[PDB]
Amino acid sequence: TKPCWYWDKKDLAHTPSQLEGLDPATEARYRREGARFIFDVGTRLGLHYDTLATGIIYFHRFYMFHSFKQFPRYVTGACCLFLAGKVEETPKKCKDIIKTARSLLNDVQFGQFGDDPKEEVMVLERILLQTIKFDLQVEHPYQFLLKYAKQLKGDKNKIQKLVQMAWTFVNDSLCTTLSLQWEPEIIAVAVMYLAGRLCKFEIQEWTSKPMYRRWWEQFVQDVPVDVLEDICHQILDLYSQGKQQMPH
Amino acid sequence: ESDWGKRCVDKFDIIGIIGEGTYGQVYKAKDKDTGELVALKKVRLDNEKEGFPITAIREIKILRQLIHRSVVNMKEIVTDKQDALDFKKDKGAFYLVFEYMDHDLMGLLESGLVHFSEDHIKSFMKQLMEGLEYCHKKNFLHRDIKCSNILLNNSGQIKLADFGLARLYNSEESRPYTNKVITLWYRPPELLLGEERYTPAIDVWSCGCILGELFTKKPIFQANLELAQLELISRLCGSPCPAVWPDVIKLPYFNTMKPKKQYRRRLREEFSFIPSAALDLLDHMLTLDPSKRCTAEQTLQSDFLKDVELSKMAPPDLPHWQDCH
Numbered sequence: 001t002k003p004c005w006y007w008d009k010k011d012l013a014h015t016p017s018q019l020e021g022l023d024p025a026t027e028a029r030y031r032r033e034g035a036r037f038i039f040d041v042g043t044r045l046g047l048h049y050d051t052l053a054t055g056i057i058y059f060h061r062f063y064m065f066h067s068f069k070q071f072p073r074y075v076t077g078a079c080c081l082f083l084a085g086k087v088e089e090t091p092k093k094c095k096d097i098i099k100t101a102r103s104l105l106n107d108v109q110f111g112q113f114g115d116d117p118k119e120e121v122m123v124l125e126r127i128l129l130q131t132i133k134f135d136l137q138v139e140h141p142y143q144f145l146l147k148y149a150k151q152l153k154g155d156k157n158k159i160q161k162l163v164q165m166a167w168t169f170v171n172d173s174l175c176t177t178l179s180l181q182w183e184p185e186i187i188a189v190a191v192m193y194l195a196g197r198l199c200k201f202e203i204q205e206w207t208s209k210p211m212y213r214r215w216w217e218q219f220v221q222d223v224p225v226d227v228l229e230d231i232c233h234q235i236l237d238l239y240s241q242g243k244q245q246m247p248h
Numbered sequence: 249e250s251d252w253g254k255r256c257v258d259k260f261d262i263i264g265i266i267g268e269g270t271y272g273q274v275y276k277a278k279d280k281d282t283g284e285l286v287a288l289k290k291v292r293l294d295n296e297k298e299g300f301p302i303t304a305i306r307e308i309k310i311l312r313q314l315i316h317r318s319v320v321n322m323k324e325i326v327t328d329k330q331d332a333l334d335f336k337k338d339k340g341a342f343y344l345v346f347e348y349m350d351h352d353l354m355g356l357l358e359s360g361l362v363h364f365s366e367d368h369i370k371s372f373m374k375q376l377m378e379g380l381e382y383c384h385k386k387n388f389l390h391r392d393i394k395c396s397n398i399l400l401n402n403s404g405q406i407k408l409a410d411f412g413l414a415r416l417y418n419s420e421e422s423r424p425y426t427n428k429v430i431t432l433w434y435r436p437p438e439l440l441l442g443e444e445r446y447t448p449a450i451d452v453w454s455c456g457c458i459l460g461e462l463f464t465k466k467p468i469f470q471a472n473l474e475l476a477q478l479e480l481i482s483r484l485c486g487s488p489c490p491a492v493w494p495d496v497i498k499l500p501y502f503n504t505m506k507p508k509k510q511y512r513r514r515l516r517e518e519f520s521f522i523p524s525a526a527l528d529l530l531d532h533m534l535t536l537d538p539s540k541r542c543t544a545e546q547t548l549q550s551d552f553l554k555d556v557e558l559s560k561m562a563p564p565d566l567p568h569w570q571d572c573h
């Protein structure tokens with residue numbers, strides 16, 4: 001009925017761009033840059049966080065079937081956001097996406113759009129839809145971050161700090177291929193885990209079973225600690241030699 | 249199976265145009281491989297301001313979530329043909345593939361060549377309210393039920409169609425929705441009076457109008473404007489008032505839109521000729537107050553539909569083919 005949208009570490013090393021000779025560090029950067037492009041353009045147009053996230057998921061999925069050497073980052077980013085607005089009932093005119101894209105991008109970056117920027121995006125939509133197999137409905141980690149956090153019972157300032165940190169880490173995760181690796185429920189639990197560790201919070205003490213160390217088992221079933229550690233490490237790698245600084 | 253969009257329209261043989269839809273022509277066709285009949289909703293996109301129609305996106309979103317016997321299902325999506333080595337030159341179109349259905353209910357009644365018995369009506373309503381129960385259970389409103397959107401094949405299978413204008417519903421808390429929905433003849437009184445925070449009751453009203461229409465062979469509330477439409481409903485169902493419908497005073501147009509006089513309900517008089525159990529169902533379905541109105545689950549639990557075994561029911565003598573018009 002519905003297609004599978006999850007790949008191994010091995011499969012993510014053999015993407016169409018890697019096969020065309022693009023090294024992993026460069027593909028990582030193109031994915032980082034393209035996600036932030038979607039994020040920044042949609043934020044300037046005042047779009048909902050699920051719209052941005054839906055745009056970014058389409059973008060990450062697109063480049064499991066196509067190479068960056070054949071399809072320029074930012075055009076695809078613009079096309080992914082344009083379709084996402086329509087799917088998430090927050091439509092914007094393509095015209096306005098191009099306008100906002102121009103203000104953010106330099107002349108070399110915007111060169112990707114060619115002579116007629118709108119036309120390049122409209123043309124690509126046909127392929128975008130085919131590539132995502134018309135599977136338009138997508139769920140993100142934010143809703144699960146909220147659902148699981150509402151069920152915690154304790155100091156409201158510390159919990160708020162957790163949720164606020166966790167929220168930032170969900171944004172950060174969308175730069176990576178984590179949405180291609182793990183379900184949004186898992187990534188939600190992982191960012192809570194990450195924030196809790198950084199804040200020196202013991203989240204089990206806020207749960208229905210205060211004694212048991214694996215607090216996450218009441219939200220997400222059958223997920224070992226190693227998976228959450230790996231998600232954390234991928235998110236923290238974004239702050240390593242990228243020269244970003246993390247919240248609070 | 250799940251790899252939609254990339255299979256080609258060459259795979260089907262186009263028999264001919266059926267009619268016009270929301271976002272393009274609709275075509276009858278036969279699959280070259282399986283020999284199976286389908287309808288092809290064409291979706292053009294070289295034209296149009298914002299590319300692939302958002303209305304088509306909505307219909308795709310919903311129909312992939314709805315899997316049921318008596319609901320029209322989308323089998324796949326299929327494309328034209330995309331030339332040698334330039335997708336930028338390629339400006340073709342997509343086709344939404346649906347199981348072909350022989351008739352719609354409006355067509356069958358408008359001909360005057362078909363007569364539905366009590367057993368035929370039992371079977372249609374059983375099927376209709378099963379698909380509608382399923383949709384409501386999954387938090388979806390149809391918002392456009394009418395005779396032209398109820399399809400029927402020659403083996404007696406009924407399907408609720410056309411989820412273009414359908415919408416998600418929030419049951420855990422109330423929220424505002426689009427007022428002007430459903431074609432006027434099948435539109436409930438709450439929408440006429442300007443309700444925005446509405447329920448699945450709107451779809452049950454429309455199905456109630458259809459139940460009556462199956463006995464009268466003609467739409468029961470047939471007018472051109474909102475005011476006239478409310479006048480006609482009031483004549484049969486009684487004027488909307490707080491004694492019957494307490495919260496009606498809260499609605500925007502309760503004082504602007506008013507019937508000529510305070511009419512008494514006389515549905516049981518005007519539909520005396522219908523069976524008693526059928527009359528009980530129709531009454532509950534065309535109850536003015538949506539909070540008192542029948543739910544889709546409740547209709548299935550009614551006397552008229554309680555024991556309707558659908559496999560045991562024989563198919564109706566329907567017209568074979570139309571003479572294309």
Ligand SMILES: *[C@H](CC(=O)Nc1ccc(C(=O)N2CCC[C@@H](Nc3ncc(Cl)c(-c4c[nH]c5ccccc45)n3)C2)cc1)CN(C)C
Pocket residue numbers: 263264265266267268269274276286287320346347348349350351352355399409410570571572573
């Ligand atoms: C005539 C050529 C021919 O086949 N003409 C023709 C046959 C039947 C109809 C027709 O009236 N109906 C009734 C309505 C249902 C329709 N079948 C159908 N199946 C599936 C779907 Cl998804 C739809 C559908 C949904 N939404 C729609 C909007 C508009 C049109 C259809 C539709 N409909 C068949 C009309 C014309 C003979 N000649 C000699 C070849």
